[PDB]
Amino acid sequence: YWKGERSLPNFKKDMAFPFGLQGISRLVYDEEKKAFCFRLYRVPFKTYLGKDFTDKRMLLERLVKGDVKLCASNIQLNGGKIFWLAVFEIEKEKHSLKPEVIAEASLSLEYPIVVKTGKNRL
DNA sequence: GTCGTTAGTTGTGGGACTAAAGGATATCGTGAACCGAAAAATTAGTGTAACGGGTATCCCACAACGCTAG
């Protein structure tokens, strides 16, 4: 900005507006309605996992019991539906990896990924 | 004496002549002239640059807090 190679941002109107973790409250699992309930600044909200009884199902419960950390999230609205962009802080996964073993990856427009690993081609 | 018949030539024509390997050849003579056919080569004619919003995609960088008081 001192030299000048960037214009001042002109924010759009459909922006997902941000809300901090200091606003999530009354998080519980109401079994009667089969949906998590919470308040986004004094308004009830039934969460629609739908047919997602495993993927993010044990993620909100990982927060109702205080086991996963959440960051300043955002919220989108796309014409009747409402979406929450929750920045959950997930951890790394440890496998049985060998640093000496090297995978040779190449990316081209004819073959998006071509990978060598010893005698294994993918 | 004369005519058809039969058998034995006699001349003439058509059909055979291992298997295995290999496998190169050279091939004259000349009369003219005009018309038609199609296949080929040469020649004659037309040309952009940035712009308004608005929006689809790309690369490229950064963010995604924590504490205190009413």
Give how far Cα A23 sits from Cα of A6, A63, A113, Å.
34, 14, 43
Whether residue A19 contacts residue A74, with contact meaning beta carbons closer than 8 Å, is answered with yes
Amino acid at A84: W
DSSP-derived 3-state class of residue A20: coil
Experimental method: cryo-EM
Q: What's the start-to-end Cα distance of chain A, in Å?
A: 46
In Å, how far from its chain's centre is CA A7? Answer: 30
List the structure tokens of A37: 């309930």
In the complex, which nucleotide's C1' lies nearest to the CA atom of residue A89? B64
Residue reference for tokens 């009747």 = A80
Residue whose C-alpha is closest to residue A71's, from A23, A26, A21, A25: A21
Q: Which residues touch strand B (CB under 7 A)?
A: A 20-22, 71-72, 87
Task: Estimate in Å the CA A45 to C1' B32 gap, whole number.
Answer: 114
Amino acid at A31: E
Task: Estimate in Å the CA A85 to C1' B35 gap, whole number.
Answer: 94
- Whole-angstrom Cα distance, residue A113 to residue A111? 6
Q: List bases, strand B, within 7 Å of protein CB.
A: 64-68
Task: Estimate in Å the CA A55 to C1' B31 gap, whole number.
Answer: 105
Ranges assigned E (strand) in chain A: 17-19, 24-30, 35-40, 44-46, 69-70, 73-77, 82-85, 88-89, 104-106, 114-117, 120-121
Give how far Cα A19 sits from Cα of A10, A40, A102, A106, Å.
20, 9, 43, 40
In the complex, which nucleotide's C1' lies nearest to the CA atom of residue A70? B64
- Whole-angstrom Cα distance, residue A14 to residue A12? 6
Q: What letter would DSSP give residue A16?
A: P
